[PDB]
């Protein structure tokens, strides 16, 4: 970090660089998902698929 | 009562197929249903069940003793709400039907 009360420092607000950040974000259930819940095939081996 | 050798043959042939069961079994145990139905006493060797309950359907029914019917039957089609398209109805059609064959016209 530098020295605040400093020179060479630019105040130019433009359109351009229309102040943001983030605000709040999307938490919409339907959004939530993606997707499938990890299972496995009982226990035992390359068998019990069903 | 005692098979003929004509119902074994066909038995046999029909066996001699494809397709696969769900409840198999290791060779050192006898695995006899998890779903309680089987009168299951305790045998010398098989210890119980399939060791793995997994899921099917079941139920209890005694069969119904209807002898050799001499007569063709018909059929009510009650439909349920799988509906396949067109082409492949016609095309199982061709591949199932016994047709061509030759009609008994009958009177006019």
């Given amino acids: ?12 607000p433009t359109s351009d660089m229309t102040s943001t950040a983030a605000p709040a974000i999307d938490l919409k259930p339907g959004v939530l998902n993606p997707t499938g819940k990890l299972w496995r095939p009982v226990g035992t081996s390359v068998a019990t698929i069903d | ?9 066909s038995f046999v042939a029909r066996l001699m197929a494809e397709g696969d069961p769900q409840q198999w079994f290791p060779y050192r145990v006898d695995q ?22 997994v899921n099917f359907p079941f139920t209890t029914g005694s069969y119904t ?9 018909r059929l009510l089609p009650q439909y349920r709400n799988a509906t396949i398209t067109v082409q492949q109805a016609d095309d199982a059609y061709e591949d199932t039907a016994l047709s061509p064959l030759i009609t008994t ?4």
Avoid: K, Q
Wanted: aromatic share 16%; charged share 10%.
């Fill in chain 2, 65 to 73: 003793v209807v002898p050799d019917a001499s007569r063709p039957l």
């Fill in chain 2, 32 to 53: 006899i249903l998890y779903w309680p139905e089987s009168p299951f006493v305790p045998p010398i060797g098989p210890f119980y069940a399939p060791f793995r309950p």
């Fill in chain 2, 105 to 108: 016209h009958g009177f006019c």
């Fill in chain 2, 1 to 9: 009562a005692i098979p003929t050798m004509s119902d074994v043959r």
């Fill in chain 1, 1 to 12: 970090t530098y020295n605040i009360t400093g020179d060479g420092n630019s105040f130019t």
